[PDB]
């Protein structure tokens, strides 16, 4: 058996590791019910300028990406995206949400919104920390 | 400005949110130096049967996926994959590694290896918890 180290992206190799791990997790822990949850912010010509990317699985919303366009900052837009995601997650029957960040301004936004820190690590090479937060419904 | 909720995967929409967030993070927090780190376990005909998928960024190794084939379990293979990843991460000048799991047997493996819990949440709908762990070099 050969153990091969690589530093390049490879879709087929990554799939060949992900698929059996997913199958293993299904067999052991039951259905994940993984379902995407995105909110796009779109201008007059339907272009995506920002939004939220996440998903619900195993009763929890994970927010993966959130971007607010420069022109729309300081205007409750990030909280609006979080509120739209939470509303949809509650509809799907979720028990809570989680989120992570290295940005102190995003961290403040999430905390004001109602997330509570669950752990952190750092520093990163650039001096920031990663913080994980949850919000139980 | 239109806020559009969706529950289907969309590469172009997700890219249109990820790219400016990456550009924002570069401008504010400097270079990430994101670099893939994979280890494939390959049989005699070069097929991937398992391995580790991760990356290094901002001084830290993140292990995203780890799968050991059924025939190779209870044989120090998951620790071997972690050791190969750590060796490469140290070479790249990383300060530490982090990892997460909902599998109590994977959690035990990671703890024995030398990871230490940084936080957790749960329960999930299926009854398990998510645990995050770190290992500082």
From Swiss-Prot, chains A, B:
<keyword id="KW-0808">Transferase</keyword>
<dbReference type="Pfam" id="PF00583">
    <property type="entry name" value="Acetyltransf_1"/>
</dbReference>
<feature type="binding site">
    <location>
        <position position="74"/>
    </location>
    <ligand>
        <name>CoA</name>
    </ligand>
</feature>
<feature type="binding site">
    <location>
        <begin position="108"/>
        <end position="110"/>
    </location>
    <ligand>
        <name>CoA</name>
    </ligand>
</feature>
<feature type="binding site">
    <location>
        <begin position="66"/>
        <end position="68"/>
    </location>
    <ligand>
        <name>CoA</name>
    </ligand>
</feature>
<keyword id="KW-0012">Acyltransferase</keyword>
<dbReference type="InterPro" id="IPR000182">
    <property type="entry name" value="GNAT_dom"/>
</dbReference>
<comment type="function">
    <text>Catalyzes the transfer of an acetyl group from acetyl coenzyme A (AcCoA) to an acceptor substrate and releases both CoA and the acetylated product. It prefers glucosamine 6-phosphate or dopamine. It can also use the thialysine, N(8)-acetylspermidine, chloramphenicol, puromycin, polymyxin B, and 4-aminobutyrate ethyl ester.</text>
</comment>
<protein>
    <recommendedName>
        <fullName>Acetyltransferase Atu2258</fullName>
        <ecNumber>2.3.1.-</ecNumber>
    </recommendedName>
</protein>
<feature type="domain" description="N-acetyltransferase">
    <location>
        <begin position="1"/>
        <end position="137"/>
    </location>
</feature>
<dbReference type="InterPro" id="IPR050680">
    <property type="entry name" value="YpeA/RimI_acetyltransf"/>
</dbReference>
<dbReference type="InterPro" id="IPR016181">
    <property type="entry name" value="Acyl_CoA_acyltransferase"/>
</dbReference>
<dbReference type="GO" id="GO:0016747">
    <property type="term" value="F:acyltransferase activity, transferring groups other than amino-acyl groups"/>
</dbReference>
